[PDB]
Amino acid sequence: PQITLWQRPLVTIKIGGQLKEALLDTGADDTVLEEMSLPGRWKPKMIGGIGGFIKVRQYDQILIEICGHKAIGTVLVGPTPVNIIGRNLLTQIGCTLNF
Amino acid sequence: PQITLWQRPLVTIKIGGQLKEALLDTGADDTVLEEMSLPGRWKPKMIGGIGGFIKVRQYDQILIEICGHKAIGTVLVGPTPVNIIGRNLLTQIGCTLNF
Numbered sequence: 001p002q003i004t005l006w007q008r009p010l011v012t013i014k015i016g017g018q019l020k021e022a023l024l025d026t027g028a029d030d031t032v033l034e035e036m037s038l039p040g041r042w043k044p045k046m047i048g049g050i051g052g053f054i055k056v057r058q059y060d061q062i063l064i065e066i067c068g069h070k071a072i073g074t075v076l077v078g079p080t081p082v083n084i085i086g087r088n089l090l091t092q093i094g095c096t097l098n099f
Numbered sequence: 100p101q102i103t104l105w106q107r108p109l110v111t112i113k114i115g116g117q118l119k120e121a122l123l124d125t126g127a128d129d130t131v132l133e134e135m136s137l138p139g140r141w142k143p144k145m146i147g148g149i150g151g152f153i154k155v156r157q158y159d160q161i162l163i164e165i166c167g168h169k170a171i172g173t174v175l176v177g178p179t180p181v182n183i184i185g186r187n188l189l190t191q192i193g194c195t196l197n198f
């Protein structure tokens with residue numbers, strides 16, 4: 001589809017049997033979701049954005065469904081105010097910026 | 100043009116007669132640039148990102164050229180980690196997300 005930016009580009013994602021709302025964020029290198037439970041081992045990581053850094057838990061090889069498109073990648077879980085789909089997953093669904 | 104996301108979507112912008120690099124960020128409601136001098140009076144504003152909030156200076160009706168496209172709008176100046184072109188200006192140059 002083609003998404004205009006008059007409003008925030010929010011989409012429904014399916015992860016770990018859960019349906020959630022997330023922002024398609026071209027300004028984010030990684031994908032970060034609000035606190036939740038995911039299977040497997042995880043490692044600590046610090047990510048920085050506007051305002052400073054936050055501590056998150058890194059999970060690798062996580063399957064996420066974005067608008068029907070299956071994508072595999074690293075997902076960070078932590079105290080983010082909004083769920084963010086970053087570039088590591090946007091590339092997998094063939095998402096591009098056009099003007 | 101069409102921009103893929105395997106790398107950060109950085110473009111050259113021209114403002115105040117000078118060239119700078121900025122990130123096309125669909126996850127940003129507004130445009131925020133690193134500390135610099137702009138004309139006119141400014142108003143206060145607080146913007147919240149991944150790690151908290153920061154105080155910025157808001158300047159209105161500022162001319163800014165993004166990849167050759169001229170835009171005139173609101174620009175925030177403050178302690179941002181990188182120059183960010185947000186939705187307020189992305190819509191002016193007709194930028195959309197596609198997949």
Ligand SMILES: CNC(=O)[C@@H](NC(=O)[C@H](OCc1ccccc1)[C@H](O)[C@@H](O)[C@@H](OCc1ccccc1)C(=O)N[C@H]1c2ccccc2C[C@H]1O)C(C)C
Nearest residue numbers: 027028029030048049050126127128129146147148149180
């Ligand atoms: C390397 N670090 C990154 O890539 C990081 N990347 C980032 O933090 C990006 O910033 C550039 C950035 C790039 C590299 C390094 C540092 C910063 C995001 O796209 C950021 O822009 C956006 O985050 C999502 C969000 C949306 C809505 C509410 C709260 C958070 C955000 O904070 N938006 C707010 C904003 C920004 C500017 C002006 C106004 C407003 C209001 C909000 O929309 C993370 C995600 C991994």
